[PDB]
Symmetry: C2
Subunit: 139 residues, 2 copies
């Protein structure tokens, strides 16, 4: 099963992500982390997370506590062991600098969280149907 890593400090948002993936026909495991430090410790599979499984797909919000998500994305994609893992940025940040800088950093796609839940639920369903069903994730 595909291991999906979500780094989201918003509970309302991660709850909606869990709900969308909870009704997916594709098997998978969802690991949720709440800050940039946890995400990095995990990805670098260090102590707290030494035996931790690597993710086949990462959903990332740029605005995170402890360590900036913009930083997490850069280190993931500058690291030869993790750069191959598709990263999906899903964030509240509408800032133009962030959009460009992220794609230049090699983020796979950048998504902006709808203000209205109904649309966000639709957006997350789109992520699920595309990245978990149509896309062939790397090994």
């Amino acid at each position: 099963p595909k291991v999906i890593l979500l780094v989201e400090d918003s509970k309302a948002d991660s709850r909606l992500v869990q709900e969308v993936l909870k009704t997916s026909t594709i098997d998978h495991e969802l690991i949720i982390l709440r800050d940039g430090l946890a995400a990095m410790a995990f990805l670098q599979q260090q102590g707290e997370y030494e035996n931790s499984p690597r993710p086949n797909l990462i959903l990332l919000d740029l605005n995170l506590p402890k360590k900036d998500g913009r930083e997490v994305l850069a280190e993931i994609k500058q690291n030869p062991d993790l750069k191959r893992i598709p990263v999906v940025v899903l964030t509240t940040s509408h800032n133009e600098d962030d959009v460009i800088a992220s794609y230049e950093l090699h983020v796979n796609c950048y998504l902006t969280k709808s203000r209205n839940l109904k649309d966000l639920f639709k957006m997350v369903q789109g992520i699920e149907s595309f990245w978990l069903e149509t896309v062939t994730l790397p090994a």
Copy 2:
């Protein structure tokens, strides 16, 4: 509200067609530009010759097994070009070799898609690309 420009680099006229039909039922303002080989693809992208002032694509659908120039090489050069780098590239090819998949990812492909051997399931696939990349995704300038 500028038109969405899509570059389809595909040698199979059939698969080529299916993509046109799929996009023909979209309400999204767009322009689909189809190319038949890898050399032609880099020429268009580097706006030379007949492709002078060629429109900058917002999305690129790339088949890998192409004549004249490997789609893998095209992806390689596209993602190393400071000018083309950010343009999302959606590999959409026949093979699903763990080797090609991993290679394409190491070369910075945004996502890799294997053409379904099932005509129907492929329509859906193409529908997803249109839906996700042209409506849901926040594309870069």
